[PDB]
Every structure is written in structure tokens, then in C-alpha cells.
Design a protein around this ligand. Sequence first.
Ligand SMILES: *[C@@H]1O[C@H](CO)[C@@H](O[C@@H]2O[C@H](CO)[C@@H](O[C@@H]3O[C@H](CO[C@H]4O[C@H](CO)[C@@H](O)[C@H](O)[C@@H]4O)[C@@H](O)[C@H](O[C@H]4O[C@H](CO)[C@@H](O)[C@H](O)[C@@H]4O)[C@@H]3O)[C@H](O)[C@H]2NC(C)=O)[C@H](O)[C@H]1NC(C)=O
Ligand SMILES: *[C@@H]1O[C@H](CO[C@@H]2O[C@@H](C)[C@@H](O)[C@@H](O)[C@@H]2O)[C@@H](O[C@@H]2O[C@H](CO)[C@@H](O)[C@H](O)[C@H]2NC(C)=O)[C@H](O)[C@H]1NC(C)=O
Ligand SMILES: *[C@@H]1O[C@H](CO[C@@H]2O[C@@H](C)[C@@H](O)[C@@H](O)[C@@H]2O)[C@@H](O[C@@H]2O[C@H](CO)[C@@H](O)[C@H](O)[C@H]2NC(C)=O)[C@H](O)[C@H]1NC(C)=O
Ligand SMILES: *[C@@H]1O[C@H](CO)[C@@H](O[C@@H]2O[C@H](CO)[C@@H](O)[C@H](O)[C@H]2NC(C)=O)[C@H](O)[C@H]1NC(C)=O
Ligand SMILES: [Zn+2]
Ligand SMILES: [Zn+2]
Ligand SMILES: [Zn+2]
Ligand SMILES: [Zn+2]
Ligand SMILES: [Zn+2]
Length: 426
Amino acid sequence: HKLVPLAPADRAPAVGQFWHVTDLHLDPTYHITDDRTKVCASSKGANASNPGPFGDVLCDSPYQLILSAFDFIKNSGQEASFMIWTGDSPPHVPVPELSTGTVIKVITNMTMTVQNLFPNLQVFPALGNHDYWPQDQLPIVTSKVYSAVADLWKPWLGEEAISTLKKGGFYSQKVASNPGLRIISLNTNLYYGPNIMTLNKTDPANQFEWLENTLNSSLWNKEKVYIIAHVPVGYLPYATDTPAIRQYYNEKLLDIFRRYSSVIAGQFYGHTHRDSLMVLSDKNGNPLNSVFVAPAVTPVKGVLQKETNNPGVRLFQYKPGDYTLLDMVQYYLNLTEANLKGESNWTLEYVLTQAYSVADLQPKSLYALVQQFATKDSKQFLKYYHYYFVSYDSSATCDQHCKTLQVCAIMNLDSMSYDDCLKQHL
Ligand SMILES: *[C@@H]1O[C@H](CO)[C@@H](O[C@@H]2O[C@H](CO)[C@@H](O[C@@H]3O[C@H](CO[C@H]4O[C@H](CO)[C@@H](O)[C@H](O)[C@@H]4O)[C@@H](O)[C@H](O[C@H]4O[C@H](CO)[C@@H](O)[C@H](O)[C@@H]4O)[C@@H]3O)[C@H](O)[C@H]2NC(C)=O)[C@H](O)[C@H]1NC(C)=O
Ligand SMILES: *[C@@H]1O[C@H](CO[C@@H]2O[C@@H](C)[C@@H](O)[C@@H](O)[C@@H]2O)[C@@H](O[C@@H]2O[C@H](CO)[C@@H](O)[C@H](O)[C@H]2NC(C)=O)[C@H](O)[C@H]1NC(C)=O
Ligand SMILES: *[C@@H]1O[C@H](CO[C@@H]2O[C@@H](C)[C@@H](O)[C@@H](O)[C@@H]2O)[C@@H](O[C@@H]2O[C@H](CO)[C@@H](O)[C@H](O)[C@H]2NC(C)=O)[C@H](O)[C@H]1NC(C)=O
Ligand SMILES: *[C@@H]1O[C@H](CO)[C@@H](O[C@@H]2O[C@H](CO)[C@@H](O)[C@H](O)[C@H]2NC(C)=O)[C@H](O)[C@H]1NC(C)=O
Ligand SMILES: [Zn+2]
Ligand SMILES: [Zn+2]
Ligand SMILES: [Zn+2]
Ligand SMILES: [Zn+2]
Ligand SMILES: [Zn+2]
């Protein structure tokens, strides 16, 4: 009778779970019509290829598609303690067809959709490069869009988070359901090539200084951190020697992450609309940090592209109170199948540990996997390349040059190591 906190009953080890959704790209104009050049503004005058109620590969997301993704989550039977949402809500239309008010309108719509369906779920958003008007021009001082999302996302964020969000589009925030876990939501659009507003700035919106201080505080307060952002660090895996953010910023951000690798238990990005892994390593090739790029809900592609993604959403498993990543479950919609019969069947695509026969998502485990990808005719890599497009096309092939680009980007996030990998493997 000493009022002792009740000790857990010895049982099978519980795991925590959270959702990651990204790149919704709602197109409010979507509607089926005979003139296929009028199905969606986002096809920019192209004929929709084969449109249905859940969308088209040349179009951004019909509302019904986004709705079906969130209804799948809600009825999935999966318990989750939070969700990360890494941005990009307006669709791909020319700048003159949007405005600041319209951008805010679409972000509001996506935010309220989530809040209505998931009223008890803490959500951690990050801004995407399309979450501003004109696109990509995210500023280094406060702005209407920053002020708007600060209000929209107040239910999820504390006063501190709201203040930094309003100033620069970034924040950190303790996870109410998970003591000892902090989310750091970066505005990596400040580092994105097309952003005129940050040309020649060594530390736009002071995000690097803020990030270094935030991580140091977490290190000393014994927290763990999940980093989330829209545009990823590292190299585009389909292009040669092309960093996803400006090289100066990539190198500087990576050095921070390497220095605080003991505190960072995960990094989660979108923007590419593909399913990609990266492993941050030191200069000598030792793995330090696992990086997960998540595919988009939208299936949009340009006419010039051959492949695109199926819609996807994903879920992570972690060790409770510790926050080590245990597994990832990717879900998807076979878009063609769903448009043909008119009914969504969001379903399991793969479970990372089972697909690749790894114990967990720790850097050394993923590093060992990717050194398998490097082997000639690796069946593991073939699977990875199938999932890269979220199983859009099992006959898509990756020739020697393509695979070199993929594997080099998976393993080498900084310029010196990426270039050395090209020297050895081109
Ligand atoms: C998401 O959902 C879609 C639609 O259900 C699935 O796509 C279908 O997949 C099946 C099986 O993979 C395909 O059936 C086979 O197609 C092969 C031809 O490939 C292309 O060529 C046709 C030619 O008209 C194109 O129209 C089309 O785009 C195909 O991509 C054929 O070789 C097969 O014929 C053989 O099948 C059996 C033998 O096993 C025999 O019955 C036949 O006589 C013959 O020997 C077969 O036709 C089907 O074409 C696909 N449909 C579409 C619209 O692409 C995806 O697989 C699914 N995604 C995932 C991840 O499962
Ligand atoms: C968009 O498509 C229209 C319609 O073309 C037809 O439908 C397509 C889905 C496909 O089946 C084509 O083979 C068809 O021709 C295009 O307009 C057609 O263009 C050709 C060439 O002038 C002509 O034979 C048709 O009569 C045209 N119109 C119709 C109603 O068929 C239109 O050019 C396409 N737009 C773009 C930007 O590609
Ligand atoms: C990172 O933080 C350490 C720890 O300092 C503490 O950090 C928080 C707990 C907060 O409460 C701060 O006010 C604390 O001081 C810093 O280490 C300090 O370094 C200074 C020299 O600059 C030294 O005089 C102090 O004695 C150190 N404190 C301890 C406890 O060792 C460190 O400077 C910070 N690193 C960076 C890059 O800012
Ligand atoms: C987000 O936008 C969608 C589409 O613009 C809204 O859904 C439509 O709302 C109007 C009602 O004003 C109806 O006429 C349509 O039939 C609705 N459905 C579709 C598929 O267009 C949706 O209500 C908006 N959500 C929020 C929270 O504002
Ligand atoms: Zn996007
Ligand atoms: Zn884009
Ligand atoms: Zn983007
Ligand atoms: Zn080449
Ligand atoms: Zn280079």
C-alpha cells in the first residue's frame, strides 16, 4: 500500500507504430469527361491516359483518391500513436493558375480532412515546395502561408513550435503519446534548387543554428529525435551526381546529422514520390543513420516519363520508450485495378524485414542489405527496384548504369563518397 506505479504484466513485447503520408497533391479540378484534355488541370492540356474515379497517371490526386487513403488508414485495424505528413498539397499546375489564397485553401482542406477523420491523432506536418505561392519560393521571414499553417496545425503543436513555424516554416515538438521522443520538422525547401529566396544564404531562416541547438538540447535531455522534412538529403537515385538540395546545404546538413547520429533514431522524407532507402555513413563507410523516403499518394507523371508510382502510404514500427526503428510496412493502391472496377483495395505491398530478410531498420542492418544490392544480379535489388515505383510495373528493368546510380545514391549521401562510388562502379 505504497502507491507504486503499476508494473507492466510480463507479455509479448509491444511495439509502437506511426503513419507516414506524403505528397497528396489534391487536384480539385479532377472530373471524368469525354475530352480527356479536360479531366484535370494538372495534365496541363495533355490527354489523361486512362482516367478513373481514383485518378490518372497524368493527373494529380482526385479527392476520392486522398479520401480512400485516409479511410484505409482509419479502418486498417492498425493502432498508431501519431502520424507524420511531409507536405505538398496543391497540384502541379502553372503558377498563374494558383495563388496564395488557393494554396492556403488546399492545405486547409487536407488538414481539416485529417483532423475530421482522426480527431484524437497527433499529426506532425512539414511544408512541401508546392505549399507556397509561387511554388518553391518559400521565404526566410514570416509570411501568409507560414501564418496560415501555424493556425491550421495549432491542435498538434505547442506555443514554441507555432512560433518557429510562423517565422520560418519549421519546428520541433515533443510527442505527447511517446515520452522522450521529439519530432524535428525541417523546411528543406529553403535548400531546394529552384528557391530564389535563399540564393547565397549561408543559413536561411537560421534553421541550421536552430537545428544544432535543438539537437544538442535533445542530446543533453536524453531525448531521441525523428527528423522529418519534404525534400530529402542525399543524391537523386535516377540521375547522375545530382543532390536533391543544393550541394552546399546537403553537405552542411549531413555534417550536423553525422555529428548527432546517436540522438537521431530516424529520418523521413518525401518529395521524390518514390520508395527509397538511404544510409548515412561516415567518410570511411561505417553506417550511422537510416533514411526512409516515402512514395506519394498522387500517381502523377509528366508525359516525358515512362514509369510512375502507385499511390502509397506507410507505417513504421518502433521500440516503445526507446524509439529504435523495428520495421516498415508499405501499403499501396493498384490504381489501374481500382479504376477498372471502381472500388479501392488499399493493400499490403511489403513488410521491410520480411521482404529483405533483415532483423530491423538499424543502420548496420540496412547497410548489410544494400551491400547485397551491389552483387551482380542481386534478387534483393530487383525487388527493391520493383518497390521503388510501388510495384507500378514488374517488367521495368534497371540496366547496369541505372543500378549503379541507384546503389551509389543509397549508400553515399555526401559528395566525396558519392563521387568515389562512381569512380569505382561506372
Ligand atoms: C495491378 O493490377 C493490374 C490489373 O489487374 C495488373 O496488371 C495485369 O497483370 C496481369 C498479370 O501480371 C497481366 O496479364 C498478362 O499480361 C502479359 C502481357 O503484358 C502486357 O501486354 C499486354 C498486351 O495487350 C498489355 O495490354 C498489358 O499492358 C500487359 O502489361 C501476358 O504475357 C499474359 O498472358 C499470358 O497469361 C497467362 C499465362 O500465365 C495465359 O492466360 C495467357 O494465355 C498468356 O500465356 C497476361 O495477359 C495483365 O495484362 C495486366 N493488366 C494491365 C492492364 O496491365 C498488375 O499486375 C497489378 N499489380 C500488381 C503489383 O500485382
Ligand atoms: C487528345 O486526344 C484527342 C482525341 O484523339 C483520339 O483519341 C485519343 C484518345 C486516341 O485514341 C487517338 O488515336 C484519337 O485520334 C486528339 O484529337 C485527335 O487528333 C487526331 C489528329 O488530329 C485526329 O485523328 C482526331 O480526329 C482528333 N480528334 C478526335 C476527337 O479524335 C487530341 O489532339 C489529343 N490532344 C493532345 C494534346 O494530345
Ligand atoms: C550543448 O550543450 C552543452 C550542455 O550545456 C547545457 O545544455 C542545456 C542542458 C542547457 O541547459 C544549457 O544552458 C547548458 O549549459 C554545452 O556545454 C557547455 O559548454 C560551455 C562552453 O561553451 C561550458 O562552459 C559549460 O560548462 C558546458 N556545460 C556542460 C553541462 O557541460 C555545449 O556548449 C552545447 N553545444 C553547442 C554546440 O551549443
Ligand atoms: C475538400 O475539397 C473537396 C473537393 O473540392 C470537398 O468535397 C466536395 O465538397 C462539395 C461541397 O461543398 C461537394 O459538392 C462535392 O461533391 C464534394 N466532394 C467531391 C469529391 O468533390 C471536401 O468537402 C473538402 N473538404 C473540406 C474539409 O473542406
Ligand atoms: Zn510532391
Ligand atoms: Zn513537384
Ligand atoms: Zn515536392
Ligand atoms: Zn553515365
Ligand atoms: Zn560530383
